[PDB]
Amino acid sequence: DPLVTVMKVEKAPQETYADIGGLDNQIQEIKESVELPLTHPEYYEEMGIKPPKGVILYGPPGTGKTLLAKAVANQTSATFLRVVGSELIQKYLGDGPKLVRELFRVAEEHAPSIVFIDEIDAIGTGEREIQRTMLELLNQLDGFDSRGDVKVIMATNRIETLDPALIRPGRIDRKIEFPLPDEKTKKRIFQIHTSRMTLADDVTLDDLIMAKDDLSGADIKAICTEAGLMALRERRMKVTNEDFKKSKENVLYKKQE
Amino acid sequence: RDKAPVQPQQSPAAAPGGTDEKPSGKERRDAGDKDKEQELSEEDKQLQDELYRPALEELRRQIRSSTTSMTSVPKPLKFLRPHYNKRFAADIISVLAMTMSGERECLKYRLVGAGEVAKEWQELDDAEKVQREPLLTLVKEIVPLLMEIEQVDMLEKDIDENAYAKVCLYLTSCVNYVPEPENSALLRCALGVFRKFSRFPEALRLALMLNDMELVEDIFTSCKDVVMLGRHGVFLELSEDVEEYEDLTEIMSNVQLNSNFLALARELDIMEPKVPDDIYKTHLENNRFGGSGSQVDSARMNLASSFVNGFVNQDKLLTDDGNKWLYKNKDHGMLSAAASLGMILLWDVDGGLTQIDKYLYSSEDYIKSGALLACGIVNSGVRNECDPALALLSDYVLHNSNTMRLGSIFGLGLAYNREDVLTLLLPVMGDSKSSMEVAGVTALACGMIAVGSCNGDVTSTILQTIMEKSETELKDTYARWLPLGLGLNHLGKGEAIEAILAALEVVSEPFRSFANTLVDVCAYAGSGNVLKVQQLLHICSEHFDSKEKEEDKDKKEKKDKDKKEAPADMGAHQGVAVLGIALIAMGEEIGAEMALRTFGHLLRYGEPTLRRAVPLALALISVSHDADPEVSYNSIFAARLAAMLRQLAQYHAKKGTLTLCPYHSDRQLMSQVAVAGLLTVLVSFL
């Protein structure tokens, strides 16, 4: 099945928890939440609690940038399990929770891992079967017969799409909120996306953090890629201001289209 | 520009036209020319032409080096004798003289075996010392001793770039791509320039490779003259082999100037820093002595709890959990648990006497024989524990001194060219007892005594064990563990002809031919000899299903440095012996994810020998993801060897011969449990 291969990644990205700033407490809450089991166990197994459920977060920007920038902290030296989009259930006939059983047996054979469910839009997007396979997803996800095996970290986009019944069994450890990226979080995202690259002196920041309006990091990474290649057309690595505004027009048009 | 004014100037063969046309080519020769020197069809008449003939030879080698040639470029320069940060000198010297003198030294290095090439090589040496482009003119002038005067002519102030870069990549490509004698030139000349320079520890690695008595003397009077201490004593004793620490203690006992190198020459000052610093800053959990010491049963998992019990040498509770634990244990477990007291008492030399004396002179011969084994393991420089066992030695069939001979002769072999241990070992090997481990710990004892000697010896020691090896053709395990000590004596050199002497007087029925291929295993510690790699692939398909396991098991020793070539398609074969070859050939390295990836498939197998052999390398290569394989074995098993061996993998989880001999002797575990009595006394662990 080719759909199983595109589920999770087996590489080790160099992006650590020290490459992003501003949300140090928000990243040390999940780092302290899921990095205590199976790693540094003197504060986990001596207490005698073992809540093998993990936190559930949600990113208003989404699109893998914020949620993969928070989940990437566990990807440094560990095995990872990725699940993106609820299309895999709706792109085929109602086979049922057998795919969840496959992820549960590969997670059983891969216990030192992190379960990451992304783009949770099952009920938001037959329709009567989605609710019962989602409630069955909550049933098998609760771990009624298994001991502490893996830490499940769910990640959705809108907190109102999930039914109130999917909260108490799933979210039992802790949940937090993510601030709005208007000027300073987009300034930090711009700094991280423009830390390795070289920019000119005349490149101002107020117009770049002003022309944007509710934008994630995938489009600014896309204009950093096409800006590095477009500026690379002249065999130069320096990104001028007029070329970065010419690439900024893709941002101004993309969100308005 | 256009060649209209200057094109009809090289056609006249007159002397003035050359003596004024050629200086214009030297002026306009800053970037060579405006094109690719298409004027060859017009200067080929000047080829035969000649007052300023050195300029004609210079321009001729300039154009021949400019377009193409193989041998005719350096001839105008070896006949020219050049005497007549810009771009000209950089172009005509740097690259044109780089490839020029490179192909001249290559053609003169391969064709013939005067001093013109020495003058060219020193001229380019100084000119490229001015150019200051390292490792490239160097990496080209490697193959042309002259390298000694080249390094001492160049190593004056640039130490970080030439030592770090040149010694790093030239040492790696000098053990990979350069043969032995030029590596010996690296050792001697590196002893020169590194003796005159700083960074003593790399010269100490040059003592790990040279094994010479003068380097440690000059580095001890120089390290003593230049003023921590216990650290370089620790890795000083770790870096030194068996030869130069007894030679070091005899020369420091001959000088006795400070007696601090005598104090650092033994095992006391390498363990007195470690034990308190390890007990203070680290605190091991007791859930593995209590847990792994609690789920034991079947009289074998309890032995795994005796080994895990031996892991402590912080917490000494499971060690001192009353008595009768050894009395309830069987013989196979009386010897292992008897050596557990030796494993748990690596320090506290003074306490070892009052801890082991309680089991000495007992009624059971195995309790006091394993107690003498403990006394031999706990000490390596005290030499005050041999007398009660070395004294009697007079049974000739069996009285407490064949098992006590295992304990004190094996533990004394671990404690150690001592002549008055072999004068007493002569009746030991000459006894020819039916017990295998007598000649086992004897050949391993004298073998580990003779490791790293002066290119070994073919004396009556290995001659005696070869004659008594071919004395009787019974119990071929003798033929399986006598080549262990034989190879321990042959170890330390590859170019020696002792392997061919064994190919002369040893070649016989495939028993001693397997002995000969074991000598071939331990006689090839590693160099650039890819002939044995293609010969390895040629003899890789031999019908004998053991010389594949050992002769192919040598892979982890031969290419132990270049770990990129070690992974191969051995796992894709169908012979289980080859799966053992790769499974043992993984090694005890840092344990990258590729290794554990190979253990994800090598682990799942149905044979108890391979399923028993996989946790040894799986858990030796990883000493995060430590508990997943143990849960995997809990899911596979839930025989006795799999459970005892997975608990011993819980033991394992949480360039010297001492880290190479024990497991190479452990490569014969597919037999009776008597070998598992020698499994509990390994010294290769860290």
Swiss-Prot record, chain A:
Membrane topology: Lipid-anchor
Binding site for ATP: G59, P60, P61, G62, T63, G64, K65, T66
Subcellular location: Cytoplasm; Nucleus; Membrane
Name of the protein this chain belongs to: 26S proteasome regulatory subunit 4
Function summary: Component of the 26S proteasome, a multiprotein complex involved in the ATP-dependent degradation of ubiquitinated proteins. This complex plays a key role in the maintenance of protein homeostasis by removing misfolded or damaged proteins, which could impair cellular functions, and by removing proteins whose functions are no longer required. Therefore, the proteasome participates in numerous cellular processes, including cell cycle progression, apoptosis, or DNA damage repair.
Quaternary structure and interacting proteins, as annotated: Component of the 19S proteasome regulatory particle complex. The 26S proteasome consists of a 20S core particle (CP) and two 19S regulatory subunits (RP). The regulatory particle is made of a lid composed of 9 subunits, a base containing 6 ATPases including PSMC1 and few additional components. Interacts with SCA7. Interacts with NGLY1. Interacts with PAAF1.
Keywords from the UniProt entry: Acetylation, ATP-binding, Cytoplasm, Deafness, Intellectual disability, Isopeptide bond, Lipoprotein, Membrane, Myristate, Nucleotide-binding, Nucleus, Phosphoprotein, Proteasome, Ubl conjugation
Covalent link location (Glycyl lysine isopeptide (Lys-Gly) (interchain with G-Cter in ubiquitin)): K70
Family in the record: Belongs to the AAA ATPase family.
GO BP annotation list: proteasome-mediated ubiquitin-dependent protein catabolic process
Associated disease: Birk-Aharoni syndrome: An autosomal recessive disorder characterized by failure to thrive, severe developmental delay, intellectual disability, spastic tetraplegia with central hypotonia, chorea, hearing loss, micropenis and undescended testes, as well as mild elevation of liver enzymes.
Top-level taxonomy: Eukaryota, Metazoa, Chordata, Craniata, Vertebrata
Residues recorded as bearing N6-acetyllysine in the entry: K91
Reported impact of I153T: In BKAH; uncertain significance; contrary to the wild type, it fails to rescue eye defects in Rpt2-null Drosophila
GO annotation, cellular component aspect: cytosol; membrane; nucleoplasm; nucleus; proteasome accessory complex; proteasome complex; proteasome regulatory particle, base subcomplex
GO molecular function: ATP binding; ATP hydrolysis activity; proteasome-activating activity; RNA binding
The gene coding this protein: PSMC1
Claim: Phosphoprotein is one of the keywords in the record: yes
Keyword Secreted tagged: no
Swiss-Prot record, chain B:
Biased composition (Basic and acidic residues): 19-47, 547-567
Modified residues (Phosphothreonine): T19
Phosphoserine carried by residues: S11, S24, S292, S294
SUPFAM superfamilies: ARM repeat
GO molecular function, one term: enzyme regulator activity
Family to which the UniProt record says this protein belongs: Belongs to the proteasome subunit S2 family.
Record function comment: Component of the 26S proteasome, a multiprotein complex involved in the ATP-dependent degradation of ubiquitinated proteins. This complex plays a key role in the maintenance of protein homeostasis by removing misfolded or damaged proteins, which could impair cellular functions, and by removing proteins whose functions are no longer required. Therefore, the proteasome participates in numerous cellular processes, including cell cycle progression, apoptosis, or DNA damage repair. Binds to the intracellular domain of tumor necrosis factor type 1 receptor. The binding domain of TRAP1 and TRAP2 resides outside the death domain of TNFR1.
Entry protein name: 26S proteasome non-ATPase regulatory subunit 2
